[PDB]
Amino acid sequence: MYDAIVVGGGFSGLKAARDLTNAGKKVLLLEGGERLGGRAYSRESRNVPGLRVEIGGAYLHRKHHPRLAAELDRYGIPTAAASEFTSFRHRLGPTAVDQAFPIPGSEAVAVEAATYTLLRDAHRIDLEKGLENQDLEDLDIPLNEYVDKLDLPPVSRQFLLAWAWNMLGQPADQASALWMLQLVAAHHYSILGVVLSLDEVFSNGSADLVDAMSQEIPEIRLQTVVTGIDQSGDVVNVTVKDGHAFQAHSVIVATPMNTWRRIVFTPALPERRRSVIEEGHGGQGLKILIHVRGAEAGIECVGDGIFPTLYDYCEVSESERLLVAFTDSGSFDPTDIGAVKDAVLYYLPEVEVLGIDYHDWIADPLFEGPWVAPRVGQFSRVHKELGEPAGRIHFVGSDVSLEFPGYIEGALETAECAVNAILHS
Amino acid sequence: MYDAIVVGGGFSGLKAARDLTNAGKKVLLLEGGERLGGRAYSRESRNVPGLRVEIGGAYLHRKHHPRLAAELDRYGIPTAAASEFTSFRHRLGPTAVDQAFPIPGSEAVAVEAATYTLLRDAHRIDLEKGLENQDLEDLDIPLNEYVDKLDLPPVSRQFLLAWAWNMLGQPADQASALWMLQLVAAHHYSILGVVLSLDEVFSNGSADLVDAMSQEIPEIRLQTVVTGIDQSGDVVNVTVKDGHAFQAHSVIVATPMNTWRRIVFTPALPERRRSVIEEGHGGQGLKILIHVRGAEAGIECVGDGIFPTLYDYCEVSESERLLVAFTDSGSFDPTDIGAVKDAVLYYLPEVEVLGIDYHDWIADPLFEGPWVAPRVGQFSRVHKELGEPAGRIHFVGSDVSLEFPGYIEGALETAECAVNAILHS
Numbered sequence: 001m002y003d004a005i006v007v008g009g010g011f012s013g014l015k016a017a018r019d020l021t022n023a024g025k026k027v028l029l030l031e032g033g034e035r036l037g038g039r040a041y042s043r044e045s046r047n048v049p050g051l052r053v054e055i056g057g058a059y060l061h062r063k064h065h066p067r068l069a070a071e072l073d074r075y076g077i078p079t080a081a082a083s084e085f086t087s088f089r090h091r092l093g094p095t096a097v098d099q100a101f102p103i104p105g106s107e108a109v110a111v112e113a114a115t116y117t118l119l120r121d122a123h124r125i126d127l128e129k130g131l132e133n134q135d136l137e138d139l140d141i142p143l144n145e146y147v148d149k150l151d152l153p154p155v156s157r158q159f160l161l162a163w164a165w166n167m168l169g170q171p172a173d174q175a176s177a178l179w180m181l182q183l184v185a186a187h188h189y190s191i192l193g194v195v196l197s198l199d200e201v202f203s204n205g206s207a208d209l210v211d212a213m214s215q216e217i218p219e220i221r222l223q224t225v226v227t228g229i230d231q232s233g234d235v236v237n238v239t240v241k242d243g244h245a246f247q248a249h250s251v252i253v254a255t256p257m258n259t260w261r262r263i264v265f266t267p268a269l270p271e272r273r274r275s276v277i278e279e280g281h282g283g284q285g286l287k288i289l290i291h292v293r294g295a296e297a298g299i300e301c302v303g304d305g306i307f308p309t310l311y312d313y314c315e316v317s318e319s320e321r322l323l324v325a326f327t328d329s330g331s332f333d334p335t336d337i338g339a340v341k342d343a344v345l346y347y348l349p350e351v352e353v354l355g356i357d358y359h360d361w362i363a364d365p366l367f368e369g370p371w372v373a374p375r376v377g378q379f380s381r382v383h384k385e386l387g388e389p390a391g392r393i394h395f396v397g398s399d400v401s402l403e404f405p406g407y408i409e410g411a412l413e414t415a416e417c418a419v420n421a422i423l424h425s
Numbered sequence: 426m427y428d429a430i431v432v433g434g435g436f437s438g439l440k441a442a443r444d445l446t447n448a449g450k451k452v453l454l455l456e457g458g459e460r461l462g463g464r465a466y467s468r469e470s471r472n473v474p475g476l477r478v479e480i481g482g483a484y485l486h487r488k489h490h491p492r493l494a495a496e497l498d499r500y501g502i503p504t505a506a507a508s509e510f511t512s513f514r515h516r517l518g519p520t521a522v523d524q525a526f527p528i529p530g531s532e533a534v535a536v537e538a539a540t541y542t543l544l545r546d547a548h549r550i551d552l553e554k555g556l557e558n559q560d561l562e563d564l565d566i567p568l569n570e571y572v573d574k575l576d577l578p579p580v581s582r583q584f585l586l587a588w589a590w591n592m593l594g595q596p597a598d599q600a601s602a603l604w605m606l607q608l609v610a611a612h613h614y615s616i617l618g619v620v621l622s623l624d625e626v627f628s629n630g631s632a633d634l635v636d637a638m639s640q641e642i643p644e645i646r647l648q649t650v651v652t653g654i655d656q657s658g659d660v661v662n663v664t665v666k667d668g669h670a671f672q673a674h675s676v677i678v679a680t681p682m683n684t685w686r687r688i689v690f691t692p693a694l695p696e697r698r699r700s701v702i703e704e705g706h707g708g709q710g711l712k713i714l715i716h717v718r719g720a721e722a723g724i725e726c727v728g729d730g731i732f733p734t735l736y737d738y739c740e741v742s743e744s745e746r747l748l749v750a751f752t753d754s755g756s757f758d759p760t761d762i763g764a765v766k767d768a769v770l771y772y773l774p775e776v777e778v779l780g781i782d783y784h785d786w787i788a789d790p791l792f793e794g795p796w797v798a799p800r801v802g803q804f805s806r807v808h809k810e811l812g813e814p815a816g817r818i819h820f821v822g823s824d825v826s827l828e829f830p831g832y833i834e835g836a837l838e839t840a841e842c843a844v845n846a847i848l849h850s
């Protein structure tokens with residue numbers, strides 16, 4: 001038997017397992033899939049042989065993400081600036097300016113006033129307390145309704161909505177205004193910071209860090225899917241799909257939130273958590289890598305398209321590039337290549353789409369979703385508690401971070417907290 | 426004897442006298458000088474024969490100034506857009522961008538945060554209550570100290586300070602942060618609006634409106650300086666410099682705040698007002714019209730110069746223009762033409778200064794100052810009360826407007842209030 005069993009081998013599980021190991025604990029890491037990294041997934045491009053791409057998480061910012069910064073420094077993992085935006089091809093109407101910040105002077109006063117309203121609302125959020133413990137229910141409304149109340153002129157209105165669509169991976173009518181404000185708060189109460197934190201990338205892929213961390217974990221079982229966690233006895237019993245059970249004093253659930261409903265917990269998780277766990281979060285983010293010909297370097301497009309954003313990702317050759325589009329899987333079907341061409345051509349009518357690459361995170365049984373985004377009404381009911389221990393079972397991961405939800409930093413933050421909690425007990 | 430004596434023939438006095446006249450009252454307007462208009466003073470340029478210029482108040486914004494808008498519509502007074510800024514010659518350091526809004530992307534997050542802090546502070550101000558009645562004393566501190574606490578990076582820091590210097594007519598160490606916030610509040614809680622309200626000018630000079638209003642005032646005495654206002658009897662007695670006294674049931678003091686100390690009030694004004702009235706406000710604004718050769722059209726300069734701002738005013742010929750500089754008379758001596766040349770050349774090294782034109786409002790005994798700006802500590806002690814009636818004596822003018830202080834709109838607003846008060850009594 002083990003001191004701790006960590007379930008899930010993404011950054012959260014990896015940090016938890018490594019730090020407990022170095023603290024002298026006997027740890028077993030159970031990973032359901034054939035690889036480590038989870039939603040950090042670098043691999044060879046489906047479109048360009050020999051080209052490594054990020055199919056999940058890619059972007060980081062050292063100042064917004066200090067734990068991640070420490071990991072990179074620890075293993076000497078090289079980072080590079082993310083692709084620079086130099087050519088702006090927005091779809092924000094005839095008054096937009098072709099810059100990264102496309103707001104014209106005629107909208108400046110309106111933007112100034114909305115910024116105050118937005119930041120005032122975000123400042124209501126204390127990041128330690130949980131979104132359910134702060135009387136924030138009035139803000140937990142559909143984002144389109146919240147934005148309607150800001151009464152923004154067309155360029156700034158669509159610019160905000162486009163980035164919010166990108167960021168939350170939800171259309172405006174499904175996104176929670178409160179969650180948008182949570183992201184603003186998480187970035188040091190900055191609206192700008194939400195986009196400006198797309199600062200750097202792993203030079204050699206996120207697998208660089210995954211591998212560096214996994215090397216310090218002595219016992220890892222791949223292709224081992226946990227189906228049950230039973231703490232009714234003195235020692236927690238962890239049952240697997242097609243294998244013998246494992247036992248530990250403590251268990252860290254470091255699997256995606258939308259997969260918890262598939263695990264049989266004994267006894268049942270606290271009542272307050274059950275409904276949201278059953279439902280799952282409403283995150284439907286879809287990141288599509290688009291292999292193109294005819295695109296100039298440094299393109300950024302933001303607009304009212306079915307792709308709210310489309311921007312430069314990678315130079316392939318002098319004539320070919322990868323662009324990246326963010327949308328959501330509820331609104332867009334990436335198996336419809338005709339739809340992809342139309343979505344790209346809307347912004348870039350001169351460009352030829354050669355192929356696309358993505359992972360359907362929502363269809364993957366080890367994930368059942370991309371990054372976290374609550375449905376309207378979910379997180380003002382229960383939020384902090386989703387990441388709280390249930391007896392000897394700890395819950396970690398980006399999905400439950402109060403400080404950096406939906407980011408790699410959040411996976412590392414939550415793992416830190418679980419590790420500290422276990423070492424004090 | 427009269428129903429009302431109005432002392433002072435600027436826009437405040439003119440509106441008061443006209444509106445009381447049309448309400449059927451018997452009014453006498455006493456003007457100390459040889460002209461009507463006060464700090465709205467259009468006349469022939471000292472530098473360019475046949476060119477009419479504004480030596481006092483010039484700029485207006487119909488949306489920020491609805492009473493002024495009504496006056497223009499009433500008399501069919503033509504307005505024109507103020508000179509457009511198309512060429513930017515800032516002195517804000519090497520990272521500034523040559524645009525009207527010269528803040529670079531690297532300062533965007535800092536600007537966003539400062540905007541929130543600024544607007545949050547301005548939102549503490551209720552424009553009806555008075556700056557002395559709202560526990561705002563913590564904000565009534567030197568502007569340089571307040572701005573220091575914002576910790577702005579160099580471009581935005583100097584851009585804010587330059588405009589604040591321009592606007593308040595006070596150097597940062599003498600300006601009150603609370604007053605800066607008052608101006609922000611007055612512009613519908615907008616920092617941007619403070620500068621964006623320099624929107625329009627009188628096509629034919631402010632005298633167009635002065636004359637239109639004065640035509641409806643039947644009894645006006647020019648060169649009649651009031652030295653005493655005595656309400657100890659049943660009827661107010663108004664004594665003049667070298668003339669016989671005049672008598673009225675009511676008296677409207679529509680003279681600049683810094684001149685009230687020269688009038689003998691009987692009985693003495695309420696105690697709370699006396700010290701500030703004696704002291705006078707700290708407004709030292711200085712508007713200099715600079716006749717130049719070699720300047721391209723549409724110049725705007727903002728920077729760390731002794732002229733915080735220098736911008737296009739009037740096309741004189743294909744080679745000659747007037748620019749306008751704002752500074753303050755404490756910091757700058759406009760009788761030193763060598764100093765003017767240096768101040769202009771700092772921004773515009775290719776330009777030749779041909780001459781200057783200004784009025785020394787601070788030295789003029791009918792004014793003793795340009796527009797109002799309190800000394801640190803003044804208006805958190807007494808503000809609203811300066812514009813409150815003392816028995817049958819009413820106090821009006823831009824200087825005492827709570828809603829639009831230092832603007833023509835403020836003169837019209839205060840006059841409206843006095844007129845309404847008199848008609849109800």
Ligand SMILES: Cc1cc2nc3c(=O)[nH]c(=O)nc-3n(C[C@H](O)[C@H](O)[C@H](O)COP(=O)(O)OP(=O)(O)OC[C@H]3O[C@@H](n4cnc5c(N)ncnc54)[C@H](O)[C@@H]3O)c2cc1C
Nearest residue numbers: 008010011012032038039057058059226370397398407408
């Ligand atoms: C499309 C996309 C783009 C992203 N872009 C960024 C970005 O730019 N910047 C950023 O910081 N973050 C980004 N992220 C978010 C970030 O990648 C994730 O939130 C983070 O990597 C998750 O780490 P984690 O440890 O919480 O969970 P995961 O990485 O999801 O790890 C969970 C692990 O649990 C395993 N598992 C699931 N069920 C079981 C089971 N029952 N038994 C055993 N194991 C199981 C899975 O195989 C997986 O390995 C992105 C995510 C997506 C989906």
Ligand SMILES: Cc1cc2nc3c(=O)[nH]c(=O)nc-3n(C[C@H](O)[C@H](O)[C@H](O)COP(=O)(O)OP(=O)(O)OC[C@H]3O[C@@H](n4cnc5c(N)ncnc54)[C@H](O)[C@@H]3O)c2cc1C
Nearest residue numbers: 433435436437457463464482483484651795822823832833
């Ligand atoms: C340099 C400068 C630039 C300006 N620019 C603008 C601008 O761009 N936009 C804007 O809206 N405003 C501007 N203003 C502010 C605005 O012009 C004034 O605040 C406004 O015109 C004042 O109107 P008022 O009726 O309150 O007082 P005033 O116009 O000052 O009228 C007071 C009158 O009282 C008379 N008087 C003084 N003492 C006596 C006495 N004892 N007896 C009898 N009469 C007396 C004076 O002669 C004067 O006519 C500017 C002001 C200055 C000085």
Ligand SMILES: CN1CCC[C@H]1c1ccc(O)nc1
Nearest residue numbers: 059166167198326371406407
């Ligand atoms: C940084 N966020 C966290 C989850 C998804 C990711 C992301 C990355 C780039 C982009 O354009 N939008 C969102």
Ligand SMILES: CN1CCC[C@H]1c1ccc(O)nc1
Nearest residue numbers: 484591592623751796831832
């Ligand atoms: C509009 N304000 C009111 C008083 C002075 C005036 C003003 C006009 C132009 C400018 O650049 N600064 C200040």
